[PDB]
């Protein structure tokens, strides 16, 4: 499951990412080197996802006790793309296709 709909649906129902996601730190621990675009070599069929997304810019709606996390969408191999699923602790799901410049609601 690595599509915007697939993941979105999975999260509001299961409240966790599908098993194909690993954090940056887990990835790094397995030999991932971002500068090399080698994720699919060291962690075949996994995608980066699950890390806290700051929202420093306040672009996503804040709320006390609301934490945002991100996950890559549509990744298969090579360098990460520009697609990200943004999801809150309360299961609001937003999407960005431009490296977090802009966001639109998907759930």
What does this structure look like?
- By secondary structure, this protein is of the alpha+beta class.
- The chain has a single domain (1-107), classed as Microbial ribonucleases (Nuclear Transport Factor 2, Chain: A), CATH 3.10.450.30.
- Helices cover 20% and strands 22% of the residues.
- GO terms for molecular function: RNA binding; RNA endonuclease activity.
- It is found in: Secreted.
- Keywords: Endonuclease, Genetically modified food, Hydrolase, Nuclease, Secreted, Signal.
**Helix content percent band:** 10-25%
Strand line-up of the largest beta sheet: 1-2-3-4-5-6
CATH level 1 class label: Alpha Beta
CATH architecture group name: Roll
Oligomeric nature of the chains: monomer
> Number of folding domains?
1
Succession of helices and strands: HEHHEEEEE
CATH topology, by name, is Nuclear Transport Factor 2, Chain: A
CA radius of gyration is 13 Å
Function: Hydrolyzes phosphodiester bonds in RNA, poly- and oligoribonucleotides resulting in 3'-nucleoside monophosphates via 2',3'-cyclophosphate intermediates.
Protein name: Ribonuclease
GO cellular component, one term: extracellular region
Subcellular location: Secreted
Q: What's the gist of this structure?
A:
Hydrolyzes phosphodiester bonds in RNA, poly- and oligoribonucleotides resulting in 3'-nucleoside monophosphates via 2',3'-cyclophosphate intermediates. It is built from three helices and six strands. It is an alpha+beta fold and 107 residues long.
Helix-strand blueprint:
Layout: H1 4-14, E1 21-22, H2 24-29, H3 39-42, E2 47-52, E3 68-72, E4 84-88, E5 93-96, E6 104-105
Parallel strand pairs: 1-2
Antiparallel strand pairs: 2-3, 3-4, 4-5, 5-6
């Amino acid at each position: 499951i690595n599509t915007f709909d697939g993941v979105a649906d999975y999260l509001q129902t299961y409240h966790k990412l599908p098993d194909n996601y690993i954090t940056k730190s887990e990835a790094q621990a397995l030999g991932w080197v971002a500068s090399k675009g080698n994720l699919a070599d060291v962690a075949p069929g996994k995608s980066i996802g699950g890390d806290i997304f700051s929202n420093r810019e306040g672009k996503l709606p804040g709320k006390s006790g609301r934490t945002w996390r991100e996950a890559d969408a549509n990744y298969t191999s090579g360098f990460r793309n520009s697609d990200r699923i943004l999801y809150s602790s309360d299961w609001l799901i937003y999407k960005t296709t431009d490296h977090y410049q802009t966001f639109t609601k998907i759930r």
